[PDB]
RNA sequence: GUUUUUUCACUGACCCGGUGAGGCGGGGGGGCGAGCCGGGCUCUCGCUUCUGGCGCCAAGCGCCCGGCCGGCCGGGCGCGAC
């Protein structure tokens, strides 16, 4: 069935730590454990090995990503900016 | 078109002769009752002739410039064909597919390719073929 | 693109670009007050003194 | 494959053939990654000639 | 021609003959049956050149598809992912000219 | 008469192509503290 | 009479760092001929976890230009580096991510990390997880560059010094609450003995200048002289302003 | 002049950082664009970026040098790598 009304992955912490802290960590805990589509084989096999280090269980290709998410907002916009800066160096 | 002709040079991909260069002597693009898969007969060089250099002796160069050939039926996908070609006879009378049941007739197909590859090494023709792929 | 920076200005002192656009748009919607309202210099190449003195002569 | 899974100081006793497979990079590299590097060795070394021949035929018109 | 190349496949999937995958497509190049060999852009760069080189010997055209193997699967109307796609017969289509 | 196997095999000693040849580094040796001293003593007579 | 905990910290022994399972010195590559005139190619072998460091490292293997040996480097991994990616290091190397080249040979607004504060020191600045330094502006005469550091303070830097392009990996880890004391215990066990932080007012008046009293209070101003001696220098060290931060 | 002093910059003690102290500074000769009529100057470069191969212990070319019988059976030195 549907077991819990509005606690998810953070049902494991019971009554402890407060709602608005457990409400915060749920948005993280979902993402860091979520399987992502490997951009090198297409398979949903990117799992977080450790902090900032993401591993394709199919490619055996390790990526240096964000702590709780595969891609961070900052790292993407830098990759877009470094691209755009390189479009001006060579023109 | 169909490129897997008996004029082709071929990188042996799998097996004991891994990374060796070989000449297709026969192409069977649709296999027999014995071999369902599409298979080629190749004759290549197990031991390459070592890198030879001026200020080596004529007796030393001859010793140094010795081909040890193999003759082997492979699958097509256990070979890697290339743009190169070695237009060398390698007669069908000896280098043949009735070579693997009789062991002495494999020593002669091994022996024939040895005489054929050693002479065209000495000419300097197809000098890519007689140097080992560096993997 | 089709000619050099000395030969564009002798098109820019008249309306050689501001007349060409006016005529070639009469068939789409006939428009009157066409100029090239501004030209902004962005990228000059490496400065050689000879080409400058060639503009002054 | 083809190599005995045994405590590493025992390897002195084992015969040569118990410690490798009869192939290029035998008992050192897998068959899969050898024959993908026979391809990678080749198609790079070919691509060298593709830019080698273009180098002179990009020069020669000047 | 970004949705054209998507639509020109969709018609080859309906009417024409096609081969999905690497190993089976690598036979259709080697059997001289390949007319266009499409590649997804996240295929191994070694195996991308493997296809290009075989297609050069057979004088077969290689298209480099503007999507990953998941989109090339959706371009084929298939419920899986496909990198390599050697087309044998377009049928009633115009894919291998333009 | 020219034995045609004898190929001219030149090495490209460009940055990140071939290995560097064992060239002269007499003026890049980390010298002993006495050899270092007696040379930069001779500099102080010229400085 | 007793020495304060901070002074015992410097002494060493129980406050020395736990560098047992810490995996190598996370340095740059050394400046040679192919850092200073053109570039040298290297592959990322494996992205790796360094205990006590939030950011992951990269075993990057460069072939040696002088001997037939092959060199291995541990880089503060730029975010988006993967295994079997070609990392280039030199003056003529291209301006893409996880690719070190001198700050002199990149445009303004360039995001870098593992930045050298001096030419040759092999990567000191902006090398914690999710941090970046922006190349602000160049000075071709005198050969120097303003670079905004992660704190937000522009340093004039000598332009002959190197930084890998891109933000450091493991970015945005301090977003997640350390929910329990267990997660904090385990964090600082990989680093050094600093965690169970006893407040000075809880301590006795012999161990710490804020200790003692029948009530648990500071008693003397918590803000202290910069010139104060060790044992005394405790609380808010040379506080320009203090209290709840209003304005920017 | 002598001395004091202020700002610019010098290196040579003194300090720092890296390295297995591996190519620093100047000059020369081979690419590249710009400029008068085959010649010449103030400059620019120095080889590697489609791929999770491979590379060291020199090829090449000169140059000298020791027998049997100008011909065959072996050594050194210079560049290549100013």
From Swiss-Prot, chain A:
NCBIfam families: eL43_euk_arch, PRK03976.1. HAMAP family: Ribosomal_eL43. Keywords: Cytoplasm, Metal-binding, Ribonucleoprotein, Ribosomal protein, Zinc, Zinc-finger. Transmembrane segments: none annotated. This is Large ribosomal subunit protein eL43. Zn(2+) binds at residues 38, 41, 56, 59. PANTHER family: 60S RIBOSOMAL PROTEIN L37A (PTHR48188:SF2), 60S RIBOSOMAL PROTEIN L43 (PTHR48188). Pfam families: Ribosomal_L37ae. One of its GO terms (molecular function) is structural constituent of ribosome. Gene3D superfamilies: 2.20.25.30.
UniProtKB/Swiss-Prot annotation, chain D:
It is found in: Cytoplasm, Cytosol; Cytoplasm; Endoplasmic reticulum. One of its GO terms (biological process) is translation. The keyword RNA-binding does not apply. The keyword ATP-binding does not apply. Its main location: cytoplasm. Signal peptide: none annotated. There is a cross-link at residue 55 (Glycyl lysine isopeptide (Lys-Gly) (interchain with G-Cter in SUMO2)). One of its GO terms (cellular component) is cytosol. One of its GO terms (molecular function) is structural constituent of ribosome. Keywords: Acetylation, Cytoplasm, Endoplasmic reticulum, Isopeptide bond, Phosphoprotein, Ribonucleoprotein, Ribosomal protein, Ubl conjugation. Component of the large ribosomal subunit. The ribosome is a large ribonucleoprotein complex responsible for the synthesis of proteins in the cell. Component of the large ribosomal subunit. Belongs to the eukaryotic ribosomal protein eL34 family. This is Large ribosomal subunit protein eL34.
Swiss-Prot record, chain F:
It is found in: Cytoplasm. There is a cross-link at residue 22 (Glycyl lysine isopeptide (Lys-Gly) (interchain with G-Cter in SUMO2)). Coiled coil: none annotated. It comes from the Eukaryota. Transmembrane segments: none annotated. The modification N6-acetyllysine is found at residue 8. Component of the large ribosomal subunit. Interacts with CRY1. Interacts with DICER1, AGO2, TARBP2, MOV10 and EIF6; they form a large RNA-induced silencing complex (RISC). Belongs to the eukaryotic ribosomal protein eL8 family. Component of the large ribosomal subunit. The ribosome is a large ribonucleoprotein complex responsible for the synthesis of proteins in the cell. This is Large ribosomal subunit protein eL8. It comes from Oryctolagus cuniculus (Rabbit). The gene is RPL7A. The chain holds residues 80 to 126 of 319 of the full protein.
Swiss-Prot record, chain G:
There is a cross-link at residues 41, 148, 233 (Glycyl lysine isopeptide (Lys-Gly) (interchain with G-Cter in SUMO2)). GO terms for molecular function: rRNA binding; structural constituent of ribosome. Pfam families: Ribosomal_L2, Ribosomal_L2_C. Belongs to the universal ribosomal protein uL2 family. Hydroxylated on His-215 by RIOX1. The modification is impaired by hypoxia. Residues 206-231 are annotated as: Disordered. The keyword Ribosomal protein applies. It is found in: Cytoplasm. Component of the large ribosomal subunit. Interacts with CRY1. InterPro entries: NA-bd_OB-fold, Rib_uL2_dom2, Ribosomal_uL2, Ribosomal_uL2_arc_euk, Ribosomal_uL2_C, Ribosomal_uL2_CS, Ribosomal_uL2_dom3, Ribosomal_uL2_RNA-bd_dom. GO terms for biological process: cytoplasmic translation. Gene3D superfamilies: 2.30.30.30, Nucleic acid-binding proteins, Ribosomal protein L2, domain 3. The modification (3S)-3-hydroxyhistidine is found at residue 215. Keywords: Cytoplasm, Hydroxylation, Isopeptide bond, Ribonucleoprotein, Ribosomal protein, RNA-binding, rRNA-binding, Ubl conjugation. Component of the large ribosomal subunit. The ribosome is a large ribonucleoprotein complex responsible for the synthesis of proteins in the cell. Coiled coil: none annotated. HAMAP family: Ribosomal_uL2_A. One of its GO terms (cellular component) is cytosolic large ribosomal subunit. This is Large ribosomal subunit protein uL2. PANTHER family: LARGE RIBOSOMAL SUBUNIT PROTEIN UL2, RIBOSOMAL PROTEIN L2. The gene is RPL8. SMART domains: Ribosomal_L2, Ribosomal_L2_C.
């Amino acid at each position: 069935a549907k077991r819990t009304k509005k606690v998810g992955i953070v049902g494991k912490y019971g009554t402890r730590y407060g709602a608005s802290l457990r409400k915060m960590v749920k948005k993280i805990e979902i993402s860091q454990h979520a399987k992502y589509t490997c951009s090198f084989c297409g398979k949903t096999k990117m799992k977080r090995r450790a902090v900032g280090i993401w591993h394709c269980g199919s490619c055996m290709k390790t990526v240096a990503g964000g702590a709780w998410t595969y891609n961070t907002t900052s790292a993407v916009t830098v990759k877009s900016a470094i691209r755009r800066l390189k479009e001006l160096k060579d023109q | 078109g169909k490129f897997m002709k008996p004029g082709k040079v071929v990188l042996v991909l799998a097996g004991r002769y891994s990374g060796r260069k070989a000449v297709i002597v026969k192409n069977i693009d649709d296999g027999t009752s014995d071999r369902p898969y599409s298979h080629a007969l190749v004759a290549g060089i197990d031991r390459y002739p070592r890198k030879v250099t001026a200020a080596m002796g004529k007796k030393k160069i001859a010793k140094r410039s010795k081909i040890k050939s193999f003759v082997k039926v492979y699958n097509y996908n256990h070979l890697m064909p290339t743009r190169y070609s070695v237009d060398i006879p390698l007669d069908k009378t000896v280098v043949n597919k009735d070579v693997f049941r009789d062991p002495a007739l494999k020593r002669k197909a091994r022996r024939e390719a040895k005489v054929k590859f050693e002479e065209r090494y000495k000419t300097g023709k197809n000098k890519w073929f007689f140097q080992k792929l560096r993997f | 693109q089709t000619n050099d920076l000395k030969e564009v200005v002798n098109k820019l002192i008249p309306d050689s670009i501001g007349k060409d656009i006016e005529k070639a748009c009469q068939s789409i919607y006939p428009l009157h007050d066409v100029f090239v309202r501004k030209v902004k210099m962005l990228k000059k190449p490496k400065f050689e003194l000879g080409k400058l003195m060639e503009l002054h002569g | 494959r083809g190599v005995r899974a045994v405590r590493p100081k025992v390897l002195m006793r084992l015969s040569k053939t118990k410690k490798h497979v009869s192939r290029a990079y035998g008992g050192s590299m897998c068959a899969k990654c050898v024959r993908d590097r026979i391809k990678r060795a080749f198609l790079i070394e070919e691509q060298k000639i593709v830019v080698k021949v273009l180098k002179a035929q990009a020069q020669s018109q000047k | 021609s970004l949705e054209s190349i998507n639509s020109r496949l969709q018609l080859v999937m309906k009417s024409g003959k096609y081969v999905l995958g690497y190993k089976q497509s690598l036979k259709m190049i080697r059997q001289g049956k390949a007319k266009l060999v499409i590649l997804a852009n996240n295929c191994p760069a070694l195996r991308k050149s493997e296809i290009e080189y075989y297609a050069m010997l057979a004088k077969t055209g290689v298209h480099h598809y503007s999507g990953n193997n998941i989109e090339l699967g959706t371009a084929c109307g298939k419920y899986y992912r496909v990198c390599t796609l050697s087309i044998i017969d377009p049928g009633d289509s115009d894919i291998i000219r333009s | 008469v020219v034995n045609p196997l004898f190929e001219k095999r030149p090495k490209n000693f460009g940055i990140g192509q071939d290995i560097q040849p064992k060239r002269d580094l007499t003026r890049f040796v980390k010298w002993p503290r006495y050899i270092r001293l007696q040379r930069q003593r001779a500099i102080l007579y010229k400085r | 009479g007793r020495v304060i905990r901070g002074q015992r910290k410097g002494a060493g022994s129980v406050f020395r760092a736990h560098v047992k399972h810490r995996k190598g010195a996370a340095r740059l590559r050394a400046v040679d001929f192919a850092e200073r005139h053109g570039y040298i190619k290297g592959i990322v072998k494996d992205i790796i976890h360094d205990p006590g460091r939030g950011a992951p490292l990269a075993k990057v293997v460069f072939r040696d230009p002088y001997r037939f040996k092959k060199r291995t480097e541990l880089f503060i991994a730029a975010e988006g580096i993967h295994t079997g990616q070609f990392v280039y290091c030199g003056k003529k190397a291209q301006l893409n991510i996880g690719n070190v080249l001198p700050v002199g040979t990149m445009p303004e607004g360039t995001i870098v990390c593992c930045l050298e504060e001096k030419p040759g020191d092999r990567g000191k600045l902006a090398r914690a997880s999710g941090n970046y330094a922006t190349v602000i502006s160049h000075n071709p005469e005198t050969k120097k560059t303003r670079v905004k550091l992660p704190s937000g303070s522009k340093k004039v830097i000598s332009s002959a010094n190197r930084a890998v392009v891109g933000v450091v990996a493991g970015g945005g880890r301090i977003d997640k609450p350390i929910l329990k004391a267990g997660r904090a215990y385990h964090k600082y066990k990989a680093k050094r003995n600093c965690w169970p932080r006893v407040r000075g007012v809880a301590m006795n008046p012999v161990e710490h200048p804020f200790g003692g009293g029948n009530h648990q209070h500071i008693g003397k101003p918590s803000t202290i002289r910069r010139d104060a001696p060790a044992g005394r220098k405790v609380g808010l060290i040379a506080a320009r302003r203090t209290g709840r931060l209003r304005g920017t």
